[PDB]
């Protein structure tokens, strides 16, 4: 039974190359490389991780695959390509033989997510990915979930992974008594598709981390974990740390422990084994 952190990032920091790292995120404005990640996974008895593109550009893919090439603690890479380019097939061929297992576009930052995913060229690209057993990670804000519903139903030839449980507006749960229900309804609509699975990661950072995580935030996160479990089922949940991004809000140990405590309560031993690497292993085709 593999134990896998299914979602983390690496980078040599350069401000202009990571526009999403902005004011007040000083902790991220430095290098994070596999050597810093190792002890963190060691403490959680995690054996290997999956490195996910942290910026747009083929060079990010090159970078991650270089880090990964001969490092056993990196089991796969989720890269970046322009999926709308007709040259997509020839460019991906450059990564043949490698640990590349999937792709991700930062849909959340698009101005018209729905127009973007429904685009005929992008659609053609995602269809090619699926025809070739590449996973596609879906990264959207909670409000954008209905915008990708038709896109996820359409692309059903291979696994789609919903990143960060679709980012519930955790900071709003006490101001907005519709926030949890709205997201749960959309989550359920996606989870009804058998080829879509869910990453349980990136939750601490949807809370109001600038003020500091509080006990109420942890309770809301458990409500989201419970809703994810109900909608997806225990065999379609995948742990990820979202390190180093999670450091805005919590330590790696804190991120794993809150999932661990929740899992000991809700899941059987075999289901925990799925959560902690079994599901990532089968969906990303890990050895």
Binding stretches for Zn ion (CB under 5 A): 42, 69-70, 133, 242
**Smallest gap from residue 55 Cβ to Zn ion (A):** 11
Alpha-carbon distances, residue 12 vs 17, 67, 86, 179 (angstroms): 10, 11, 30, 36
CA distance 129 to 123: 10
Half-sphere exposure of 258 (CA within 13 A, CB side): 27
Q: Which two tokens stand for residue 54?
A: 């942290």
DSSP structural state of residue 61: H
**Smallest gap from residue 113 Cβ to Zn ion (A):** 18
**Smallest gap from residue 245 Cβ to Zn ion (A):** 5
Q: Find tokens 């792709």 and name the residue.
A: 103
**Smallest gap from residue 161 Cβ to Zn ion (A):** 12
**Smallest gap from residue 174 Cβ to Zn ion (A):** 25
**Smallest gap from residue 244 Cβ to Zn ion (A):** 9
Neighbouring residues of 188: CB distance < 8 A, sequence distance ≥ 6: 231
Strands 100-105 and 48-52, sheet pairing: unpaired
Give the residue with the Cβ less far from Zn ion, 6 or 271.
6
Give the residue with the Cβ less far from Zn ion, 60 or 271.
60
Give the residue with the Cβ less far from Zn ion, 42 or 214.
42
Give the residue with the Cβ less far from Zn ion, 158 or 271.
158
Please identify the residue of the shown chain whose CB is closest to the bound Zn ion: 69
Give the residue with the Cβ less far from Zn ion, 31 or 133.
133
CA distance 58 to 223: 37
Give the residue with the Cβ less far from Zn ion, 242 or 271.
242
CA distance 162 to 197: 6
């Amino acid at each position: 039974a593999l134990r896998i952190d299914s979602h983390q990032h690496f980078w040599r920091y350069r401000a202009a190359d990571y526009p999403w790292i902005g004011a007040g995120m000083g902790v991220l404005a430095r290098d994070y490389l596999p050597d810093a990640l190792h002890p963190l996974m060691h403490a959680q008895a995690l054996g290997a991780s999956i490195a996910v593109q942290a910026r747009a550009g083929r060079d990010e893919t090159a970078f991650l695959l270089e880090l990964a090439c001969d490092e056993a603690r990196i089991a796969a890479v989720v890269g970046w390509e322009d999926l709308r380019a007709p040259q997509l097939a020839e460019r991906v061929a450059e990564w043949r033989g490698t640990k590349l297992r999937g792709f991700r576009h930062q849909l959340q930052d698009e101005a018209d997510v729905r127009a973007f995913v429904d685009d005929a060229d992008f659609a053609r690209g995602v269809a090619w990915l699926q025809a070739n057993d590449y996973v596609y990670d879906v990264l959207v804000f909670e409000r954008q979930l209905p915008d990708v519903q038709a896109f996820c139903a359409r692309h059903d030839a291979h696994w789609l992974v919903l990143d960060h449980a679709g980012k519930p507006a955790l900071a709003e749960f006490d101001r907005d008594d519709t926030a949890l229900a709205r997201w749960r309804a959309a989550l359920r609509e996606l989870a009804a598709l058998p080829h879509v699975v869910c990453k349980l990661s990136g939750l601490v950072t949807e809370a109001d981390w600038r003020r500091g995580l509080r006990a109420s935030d942890l309770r809301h996160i458990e409500q989201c974990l419970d809703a994810a479990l109900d909608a997806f089922g225990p065999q379609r949940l995948m742990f990820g740390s979202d390190w180093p991004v999670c450091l805005l809000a919590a330590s790696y140990d804190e991120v794993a422990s809150l999932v661990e405590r929740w899992a000991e309560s809700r899941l059987s031993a075999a289901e925990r084994s799925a959560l902690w690497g079994g599901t990532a292993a089968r969906c990303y085709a890990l050895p």
